[PDB]
């Protein structure tokens, strides 16, 4: 656990910090794609009216 | 960096992912093709008189 | 630690899959979207 920050050292391992970073990036990319998809779906047909 | 070395490192465990994906794709394709063929070559059900 | 990272990843992924399937089913069954016609 050398690459882990001091504050999160007792909770995370050196081999898990990178995987956590990958998960965070995947979540953000998915949120952006979901925003785009929702905008197009509203452009197709409104669902609230 | 991975959390499942037994699944993302060994060939035998690496084969199961592709096997499952292919199984799902084959099932979906077969169902869709059968129902498309059935609904395309069938006459109009109810002609009123 | 209270929760292993592997368990958290598995639980989150499965919950996301179930939510996506359920939301697609409910939205497609509604009267606004008639199963994409």
């Amino acid at each position: 656990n050398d690459l882990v920050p001091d504050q999160w050292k007792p909770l995370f391992n050196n081999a898990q910090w990178l995987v956590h970073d990958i998960v965070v990036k995947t979540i953000y990319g998915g949120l952006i794609i979901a925003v785009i998809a929702h905008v197009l779906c509203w452009a197709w047909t409104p669902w609230i009216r | 960096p991975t959390l499942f070395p037994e699944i993302t490192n060994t060939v035998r465990g690496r084969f199961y992912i592709v096997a499952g994906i292919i199984s799902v794709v084959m099932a979906v394709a077969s169902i869709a093709i059968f129902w498309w063929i059935f609904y395309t070559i069938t006459p109009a059900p109810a002609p009123p008189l | 630690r209270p929760f292993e990272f592997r368990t958290s990843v598995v639980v989150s992924t499965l919950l996301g899959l179930v939510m996506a399937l359920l939301i697609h089913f409910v939205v497609l069954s509604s009267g606004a979207f008639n199963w994409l016609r």
């Binding site: 998809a37 779906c41 | 690496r14 992912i17 994906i21 | 994409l36």
Partner: peptide, 26 residues
């Protein structure tokens, strides 16, 4: 406009699947 959206989501799904498979399969 339904078929265009269907193609869009299908292409997105294919791209994501290929990217994650390449990440794992390396």
């Amino acid at each position: 406009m339904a078929p265009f959206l269907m193609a869009f989501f299908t292409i997105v799904l294919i791209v994501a699947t290929l990217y994650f498979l390449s990440m794992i399969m390396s």
